[PDB]
């Protein structure tokens, strides 16, 4: 379990959280290309709706 550690210490009682966004701004977004994926399926034919619809 220790092999998955991503921070040096844990959350110990009275630690202060800091909100990093303090003034409104339009964001800029960077990523690794595989970090965001899209799942797409056709509407199931056996649905209650789409009953007699071609």
């Amino acid at each position: 379990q220790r092999a998955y550690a991503n921070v040096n210490t844990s959350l110990a009682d009275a630690m202060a959280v800091n909100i990093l966004n303090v003034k409104d701004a339009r964001t800029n977004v960077f990523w690794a290309d595989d970090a965001i994926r899209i799942v797409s399926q056709p509407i199931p034919a056996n649905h209650e709706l789409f009953a007699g619809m071609k």
């Binding site: 056709p42 199931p44 034919a45 056996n46 789409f50 007699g52 071609k54």
Partner: protein
């Protein structure tokens, strides 16, 4: 119909057993009537197994309203006979009695008629398994790529 309350059901059961009626000269005490009402409630709770038993429309009184007796049972007109016959059968033990053959037969017949309609409703057929094809006869289903039955 005159048997409108749990007290009425208990009185009918006692009249069937021959213990108390309107023509008698000695009557059972209200404590005994309350005990019989509690036995009726227990019997109906045992029958109606929290929705998976025999559905009749019986209403279970709450302890917030003090007297359970005096509340309308809510049964249909066709279940009163069965309910109070079964109640007489259940509460005959208390007075060192034994319900007669006619009472027992009527109790069995009434319970059977009580569950007949529920059994007819519950006799349902499961849908097609998830591994049936719909078949090519269903051209409309074929054109929509509905090639197998969903299941569940």
């Amino acid at each position: 119909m005159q048997i409108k309350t749990k007290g009425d059901l208990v009185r009918a059961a006692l009249r069937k057993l021959g213990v108390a009626s309107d023509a008698t000269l000695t009557d059972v005490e209200p404590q005994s009537m309350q005990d019989a009402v509690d036995d009726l409630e227990a019997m109906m709770a045992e029958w109606y197994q929290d929705g998976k038993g025999i559905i009749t429309g019986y209403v279970f009184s709450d302890d917030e309203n003090p007297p359970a007796e005096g509340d309308d049972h809510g049964l249909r007109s066709s279940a009163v006979s069965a309910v109070f016959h079964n109640l007489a059968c259940r509460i005959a033990p208390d007075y060192a009695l034994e319900a007669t053959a006619k009472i027992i037969a009527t109790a069995k017949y009434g319970k059977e008629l009580l569950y007949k309609q529920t059994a007819i409703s519950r006799a349902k057929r499961a849908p097609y398994p998830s591994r049936m094809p719909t078949g090519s006869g269903n051209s409309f289903a074929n054109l929509n790529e509905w090639h197998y039955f969903p299941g569940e």
